[PDB]
Design a protein around this ligand. Structure first.
Ligand SMILES: Cc1cc2nc3c(=O)[nH]c(=O)nc-3n(C[C@H](O)[C@H](O)[C@H](O)COP(=O)(O)OP(=O)(O)OC[C@H]3O[C@@H](n4cnc5c(N)ncnc54)[C@H](O)[C@@H]3O)c2cc1C
Length: 180
């Protein structure tokens, strides 16, 4: 079982996983390997990354960062999602995984949003300021919820933003992941 299952392992999904894991949650990221940044030979505008790595390298570092604090990042394509009342069942080609909350960081792909009958805002998933969709316990972040035009740093920032508010809901208090 999982506290949260993040669908999509691009900047928003991996950033979300990092914050969720650091909050001590059991988080699993299922990614289909079609991040829009994967083919970039050199990302020159991710504030702070002065070596300007390729999109492929950036993804590797983001996955490492999330795994570093407990997140599990696995390749997989979600094709089914069933609400079983209290737990969501997510299905890939490899099998089924269960989570109480789902966070969609699926970029522009309307597949899963349509499966859940999520309310839309134009071509994107409709959400409140914090990323909560029209479906209870289902969240969205990054390009998936309209943070466009899409850029790596913007999606990463939103993934963390939504994750922080997801954690805040669970702890009933404004959650901050700060360090000395
Ligand atoms: C040619 C090109 C060049 C670019 N150059 C830059 C640049 O220099 N700087 C910059 O900041 N941005 C750049 N971008 C844009 C940037 O890559 C995106 O804004 C960013 O990747 C968006 O992050 P995201 O997390 O929202 O989605 P994405 O990174 O697109 O990730 C979505 C992920 O979810 C997965 N997914 C979707 N559906 C499922 C499913 N059902 N099951 C499992 N996994 C699923 C996908 O396979 C994918 O890995 C470029 C884009 C392109 C196309």
């Amino acid at each position: 079982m999982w506290d949260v299952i993040v669908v999509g392992g691009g900047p928003s999904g991996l950033s979300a996983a990092l914050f969720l894991a650091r909050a001590g949650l059991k988080v699993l990221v299922l990614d289909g390997g079609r991040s829009k940044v994967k083919g970039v030979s050199r990302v020159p505008n991710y504030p702070g990354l002065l070596d300007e790595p390729s999109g492929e390298e950036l993804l590797r570092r983001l996955e490492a960062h999330a795994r570093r604090y407990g997140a599990e990042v696995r390749p997989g394509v979600v094709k089914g999602v069933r609400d079983m009342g209290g737990v969501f069942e997510v299905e890939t080609e490899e099998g089924v995984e269960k989570a109480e909350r789902l966070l969609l960081c699926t970029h522009k792909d309307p597949t899963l949003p349509s499966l859940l009958g999520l309310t839309r805002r134009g071509a994107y998933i409709d959400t409140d300021e914090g990323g909560r969709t029209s479906y209870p316990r289902v969240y969205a972040a990054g390009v998936a919820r309209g943070k466009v035009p899409g850029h790596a740093i913007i999606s990463a920032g939103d993934g963390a933003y939504v994750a922080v508010h997801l954690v805040s809901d669970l702890r009933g208090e404004p959650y901050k992941d700060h360090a000395l």
